[PDB]
């Protein structure tokens, strides 16, 4: 039972366990969200088929780890899908020739939020897969673990909907200008969606936000978002209606807002977070 990664790195055997680095391409689907498909990037074979007909199974206890350790889903395995983490030993995959074939596994996630996502960083842990090997012949049984690491930075969605970008930067033209904000929302199934604005407001109406400039800050001027002329205060929901696979622009615009009397030139900055809620 030899193996190697997508980048050609042979996965060591000889120590009880291993570290594996793979490329993650999460995508939102209906009911499930894909995390990683190891059919693309793990290839195993049998260097001495005449002498053995190996089997491999995903022993119970295999689970998400690292930052995903609290999540649950399913695992595609050898022709069928089972719940994940595994409460029981799965059926047996068979390796009986020197020719490589993929490790037919893929990990899914049961949505637990609206939009939302947890940021994976390269060199982090993804999941711990307890594996059990056996054979036709030598009355000989082993177990070994593969720690699954991501070698590329991604964000793993946890809701039924995704957005164009997680971090967005918009450069206001000089006072008193405004700009459109390129944000859009799409959902794999026809869903309702709203959103409310999170940030450190500055005013009594909670509609304007304070400057955060760390260098020669301007004073008396704060940001104020609006959609088609609607002032969208903080901690308030604005509904998108029914959202499907067609991405919907939030309709947000970024403005200046005059707070507290006289003004002084200088930089201006404000960081805003958008949260989505099912409706």
């Amino acid at each position: 039972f030899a193996c190697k990664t997508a980048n050609g790195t042979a996965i060591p055997i000889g120590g009880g366990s291993a570290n594996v680095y793979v490329n993650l391409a999460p995508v939102v689907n209906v009911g499930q969200n894909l995390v990683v498909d190891l059919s693309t990037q793990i290839f195993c074979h049998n260097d001495y088929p005449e002498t053995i007909t190996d089997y491999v199974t995903l022993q119970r206890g295999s689970a998400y780890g690292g930052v995903l350790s609290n999540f649950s889903g399913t695992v595609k395995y050898s022709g069928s899908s089972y719940p994940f983490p595994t409460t029981s030993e799965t059926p047996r995959v068979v390796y009986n020739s020197r020719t490589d074939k993929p490790w037919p596994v893929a990990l899914y996630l049961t949505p637990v939020s609206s939009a939302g996502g947890v940021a994976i960083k390269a060199g982090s842990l993804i999941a711990v897969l307890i594996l059990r090997q056996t054979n036709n012949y030598n009355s000989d049984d082993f177990q070994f673990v593969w720690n699954i690491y991501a070698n590329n930075d991604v964000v793993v969605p946890t809701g039924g909907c995704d957005v164009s970008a997680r971090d967005v930067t918009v450069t206001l033209p000089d006072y008193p200008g405004s700009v459109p904000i390129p944000l859009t929302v799409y959902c794999a199934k026809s869903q309702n969606l709203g959103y409310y604005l999170s940030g450190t407001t500055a005013d009594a109406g909670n509609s304007i936000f304070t400057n955060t400039a760390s260098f020669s800050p301007a004073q008396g001027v704060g940001v104020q978002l609006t959609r088609n002329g609607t002032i969208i205060p903080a901690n308030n929901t604005v509904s998108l209606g029914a959202v499907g696979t067609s991405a919907v622009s939030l309709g947000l615009t970024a403005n200046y807002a005059r707070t507290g009397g006289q003004v002084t030139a200088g930089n201006v900055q404000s960081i805003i977070g958008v949260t989505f809620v099912y409706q």
């Epitope: 689907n29 209906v30 595609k76 022709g79 069928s80 899908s81 089972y82 059926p91 068979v94």
Partner: antibody, heavy 117, light 108 residues
Framework: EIQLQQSGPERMKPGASVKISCKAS????????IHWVKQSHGRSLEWIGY????????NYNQKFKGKATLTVDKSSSTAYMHLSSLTSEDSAVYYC??????????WGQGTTLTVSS | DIQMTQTTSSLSASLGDRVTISCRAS??????LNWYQQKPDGSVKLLIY???NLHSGAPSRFSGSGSGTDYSLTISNLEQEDIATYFC?????????FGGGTKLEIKR
């Protein structure tokens, strides 16, 4: 609900090649496997193979691998069963079936193939 | 391959009875064994999966149990709807295999 709608009965000469389809609906087409099963006219059930409708990986029963072939169209959520170089024995009923937890939890209505001269 | 087998091809049952159908596996399987029911119309359905689990929608009078190389299905009280053929299939090791089938008759 989950339903697998197949094409109507076929009738081909020996030596022809036929293509059955199975239009899945009611669930995420890419998140589950699809299997194909042959019920010969002895009424015994036989297993052909599976295809993953996300990456199009297939495994074929050793009995048919040189004769059958599975393919998928992700856009329309439709799978296809193709069988070539027909003969008398290929007269049977063919089912497209989902899979979950080691079980074929939903089947199609079946498609009758007649290989008649 | 795995040569699944069902003990009897035809079961001369009678209404109200408690019939049990048992199949054997040529080698053990970790309880990955399923029960299917085919009506005379030809349509096939899944009854029970992983040796004791009732599929979502099946009648709540079907039961299964067994340990590697010995499994069985039981109906508590026959209804006329239950006259059909029954197959068991192992999903442990590819290629998946089915049994010979057992047809459910009425005695008279």
């Amino acid at each position: 609900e989950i339903q697998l709608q197949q094409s109507g009965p076929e009738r081909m000469k020996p030596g022809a090649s036929v293509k059955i389809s199975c239009k899945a609906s009611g669930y995420s087409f890419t998140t589950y496997y699809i299997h194909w099963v042959k019920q010969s006219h002895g009424r015994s059930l036989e297993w052909i193979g599976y295809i993953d409708p996300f990456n199009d990986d297939t495994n074929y029963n050793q009995k048919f691998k040189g004769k059958a072939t599975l393919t998928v169209d992700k856009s329309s959520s439709t799978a296809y069963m193709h069988l070539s170089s027909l003969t008398s024995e290929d007269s049977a009923v063919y089912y497209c079936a989902r899979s979950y937890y080691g079980s074929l939890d939903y089947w199609g209505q079946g498609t009758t193939l007649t290989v008649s001269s | 391959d795995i040569q699944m087998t069902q003990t009897t091809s035809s079961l001369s049952a009678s209404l109200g009875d408690r019939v049990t159908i048992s199949c054997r596996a040529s080698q053990g399987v970790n309880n990955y064994l399923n029960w299917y029911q085919q009506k005379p119309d030809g349509s096939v359905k899944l009854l029970i999966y992983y040796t004791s689990n009732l599929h979502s929608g099946a009648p709540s009078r079907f039961s299964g149990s067994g340990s590697g190389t010995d499994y069985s299905l039981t109906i508590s009280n026959l209804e006329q709807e239950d006259i059909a053929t029954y197959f068991c299939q192992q999903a442990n090791m590819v290629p998946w295999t089915f049994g010979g089938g057992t047809k459910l008759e009425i005695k008279r």
